[PDB]
Design a protein around this ligand. Structure first.
Ligand SMILES: OCCc1c[nH]c2ccc(OCc3ccccc3)cc12
Length: 207
């Protein structure tokens, strides 16, 4: 595996951003986290991150045990929390060669317990032979907008970091007609010293 994706489904872009109210005068958006996929990756053993996500019934080890292991990835984000009352959004684009309908479940876990879940469905859209699946500008759920504001306030980066130590997200992309899991992505978090912007690192999850 050489990127965040498998032979059926590839992630083209993902980001979480905020556009300030000024955006409609002169445009700007701040990116908290951004993957852009316009040697093989490193491994991380899935057993390491079991206790960071729910247990079974929608949890990592029940999923990884139903395979396929090449579908599972870990993304460590370094979030840029340096940027009230604007638009907070999330944007996902995937690409395949097969025509499919997709269900994208994203579960937000605090201390390894689902706190908020969103489930969307995106039908494929033919383009240059490939199919594009576009879930652009989904409004960020108000738990995360609140959470981010709270995190912005903490007095020290190392406190944000230990708070974020217990904050993970699990995205599960499944073929809605088949139920075949196509992509599973666990997200762990730290903050970035915002001269450096958002950064990230993508691993394969193995055993
Ligand atoms: O409404 C669902 C939103 C969503 C699904 N999957 C995601 C993956 C990342 C992410 O960024 C938020 C974040 C940035 C910095 C620190 C903590 C959280 C948001 C989402």
């Amino acid at each position: 595996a050489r990127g965040l994706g498998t032979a059926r489904l590839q992630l083209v872009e993902f980001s979480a951003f905020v556009e300030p109210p000024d955006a409609v005068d002169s445009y700007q958006r701040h990116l908290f986290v951004h993957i852009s996929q316009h040697p093989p990756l490193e491994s991380v053993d899935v057993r390491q991150i079991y206790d960071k996500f729910p247990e079974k019934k929608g949890g990592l080890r029940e999923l990884y045990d139903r395979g396929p292991p090449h579908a599972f990835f870990l993304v460590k984000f370094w979030a840029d929390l340096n940027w009230s009352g604007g638009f907070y959004g999330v944007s996902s684009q995937y690409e395949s060669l097969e025509h499919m309908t997709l269900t994208c479940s994203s579960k937000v876990c605090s201390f390894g317990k689902q706190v908020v879940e969103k489930v969307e469905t995106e039908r494929a859209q033919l383009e240059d032979g490939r199919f594009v699946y576009r879930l652009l500008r989904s409004p960020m759920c108000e738990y995360l907008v609140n959470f981010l504001h709270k995190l912005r306030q903490l007095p020290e980066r190392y406190m944000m970091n230990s708070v974020l130590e217990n904050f993970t997200i699990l995205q599960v992309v499944t073929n809605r007609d088949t139920q075949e899991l196509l992509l599973c992505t666990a997200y762990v978090f730290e903050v970035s010293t915002s001269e450096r912007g958002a950064q990230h690192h993508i691993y394969r999850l193995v055993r």
